[PDB]
Amino acid sequence: ALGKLQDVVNHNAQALNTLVKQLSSKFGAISSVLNDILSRLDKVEAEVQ
């Protein structure tokens, strides 16, 4: 019977989980971790990534 209240809980859990999972994508860069790009490349190329 309480499916709509459960959906109110579940949608807010799922949107935050998707937002956390979106941090691991590369988006065309060479690494998804910012510290590796800072400690791996020079100024201009790491600025591009």
Partner: protein
């Protein structure tokens, strides 16, 4: 040696680097710093900062 600039011989040496989760058998020259725990520190473990 009488050829053009585009037909000269060239020596190519290429270095291929391994960037994996394997233990670092070879890497570079930093003096090691002693380990301290339970404190907000700026660590650097095997080349990755944090």
């Amino acid at each position: 040696p009488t050829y053009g600039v585009g037909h000269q011989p060239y020596r190519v040496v290429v270095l291929s680097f391994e960037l994996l989760h394997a233990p670092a058998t070879v890497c570079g020259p930093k003096k090691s710093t002693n380990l301290v725990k339970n404190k907000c520190v700026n660590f650097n473990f095997n080349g990755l900062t944090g």
